[PDB]
Amino acid sequence: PEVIFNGPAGRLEGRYQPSKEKSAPIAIILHPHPQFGGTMNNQIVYQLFYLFQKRGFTTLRFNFRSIGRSQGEFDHGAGELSDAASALDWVQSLHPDSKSCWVAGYSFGAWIGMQLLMRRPEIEGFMSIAPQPNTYDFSFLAPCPSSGLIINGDADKVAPEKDVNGLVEKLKTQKGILITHRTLPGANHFFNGKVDELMGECEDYLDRRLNGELVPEP
Amino acid sequence: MPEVIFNGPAGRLEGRYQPSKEKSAPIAIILHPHPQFGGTMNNQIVYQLFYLFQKRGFTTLRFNFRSIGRSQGEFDHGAGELSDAASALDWVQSLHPDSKSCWVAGYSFGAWIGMQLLMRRPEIEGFMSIAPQPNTYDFSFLAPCPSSGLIINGDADKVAPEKDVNGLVEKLKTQKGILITHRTLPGANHFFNGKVDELMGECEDYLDRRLNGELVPEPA
Ligand SMILES: [Cl-]
Ligand SMILES: [Cl-]
Ligand SMILES: [Cl-]
Numbered sequence A: 001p002e003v004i005f006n007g008p009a010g011r012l013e014g015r016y017q018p019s020k021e022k023s024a025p026i027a028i029i030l031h032p033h034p035q036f037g038g039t040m041n042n043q044i045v046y047q048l049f050y051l052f053q054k055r056g057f058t059t060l061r062f063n064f065r066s067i068g069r070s071q072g073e074f075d076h077g078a079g080e081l082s083d084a085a086s087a088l089d090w091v092q093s094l095h096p097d098s099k100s101c102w103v104a105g106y107s108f109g110a111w112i113g114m115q116l117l118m119r120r121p122e123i124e125g126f127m128s129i130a131p132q133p134n135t136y137d138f139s140f141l142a143p144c145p146s147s148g149l150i151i152n153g154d155a156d157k158v159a160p161e162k163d164v165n166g167l168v169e170k171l172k173t174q175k176g177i178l179i180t181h182r183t184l185p186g187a188n189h190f191f192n193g194k195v196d197e198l199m200g201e202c203e204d205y206l207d208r209r210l211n212g213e214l215v216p217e218p
Numbered sequence B: 001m002p003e004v005i006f007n008g009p010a011g012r013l014e015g016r017y018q019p020s021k022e023k024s025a026p027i028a029i030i031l032h033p034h035p036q037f038g039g040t041m042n043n044q045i046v047y048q049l050f051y052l053f054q055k056r057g058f059t060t061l062r063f064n065f066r067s068i069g070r071s072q073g074e075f076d077h078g079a080g081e082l083s084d085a086a087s088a089l090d091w092v093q094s095l096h097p098d099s100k101s102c103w104v105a106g107y108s109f110g111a112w113i114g115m116q117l118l119m120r121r122p123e124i125e126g127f128m129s130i131a132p133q134p135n136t137y138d139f140s141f142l143a144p145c146p147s148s149g150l151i152i153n154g155d156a157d158k159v160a161p162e163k164d165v166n167g168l169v170e171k172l173k174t175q176k177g178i179l180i181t182h183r184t185l186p187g188a189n190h191f192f193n194g195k196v197d198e199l200m201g202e203c204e205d206y207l208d209r210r211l212n213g214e215l216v217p218e219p220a
């Protein structure tokens, strides 16, 4: 499972589980900013990785540049977006017949994930856990090209409800996607004491999506 | 509260504080990993340790070391963080002057700082050291370790391998008058990925047994 691949700033370290099935969808999992202790082994990041793995995806989580054994210097976002595109290119190189992808990102990783979504038409679903629309600029989502899940806590002081609600309201004006927006009572930015609750919602969301629900009629 | 700011040697230290409902309640201080491994006071294992002591009636504090979150100052190899932990313990004790006992629980780098605080502070009668790194940080100051406690590590840990943890535990087990409870969790890495429930169950069982007067040697 331990892998090293090349990104624009040098080596990027990752954890990789190929699907046992042919042409399986790919999931890329993206971690928080190091100011909030983000790495590919944060529990929420690991649990996201595990959720996709258990549902038969080819799955990759990885450390952004400067984190762990990943080379380079952390930057405001452009480099990390480039890292994420490199990581997806790498898994796709190994799985050329996977035709679809999901991205799941937590905190800063949700911002990078939604930027990747905008650039990569094969990404047909996303999860954005605790996005920070008062800290990072999400106006590039116009329109958001895919249905997905936004999940945040009502005790979050880093990215408050009012801010997440404004982003979701803007997205919900876009015909042809469904934004599933769950707010968890008592969850802070780190979902302290609420990780099981968070992961059960992400699991339910993915199961319903794999059943063909929670997207509009095309 | 529970959000608190108190003064450390390097400036402001940010914490989360839950006082006990009870009188003379013991104090628990919870210490987080190094920032290279994403350590903050809100790491899930750190939070769960905090919540364990909270639920068992302890006055409980977790906090961010200097440079982490809103805590001021620059991170250093360990001396500063030990000073931070001492300041943190002094602060809680200033608010709870009738508490006569304390536990420290630390994860990774936090376990090394925790055991150093244990060595300095006679009121500390128990500890938990989750994923200690005796191949990276020097534990040889434990001479002897003054209290019984729990060391818990995983057998898939590549940061601090089993052999290294076992060597520290074997050294401590030569010291009479304490009991080192050492659990090795199958399949757990340094981050207990997919094993946090298992880890926290073992921590809970250990504290429950210790509060029942078990897992410490007889008075003799
Ligand atoms: Cl974590
Ligand atoms: Cl921005
Ligand atoms: Cl928060």
Ligand SMILES: [Cl-]
Residues within 6 Å of the ligand: B136, B137, B138
């Ligand atoms: Cl050292």
Ligand SMILES: [Cl-]
Residues within 6 Å of the ligand: B156, B157, B158, B159, B189, B190, B191
């Ligand atoms: Cl490890």
Ligand SMILES: [Mg+2]
Residues within 6 Å of the ligand: A212, A215, A216, A217
């Ligand atoms: Mg339909």
Ligand SMILES: [Mg+2]
Residues within 6 Å of the ligand: B213, B214, B216, B217, B218, B219
């Ligand atoms: Mg006895």
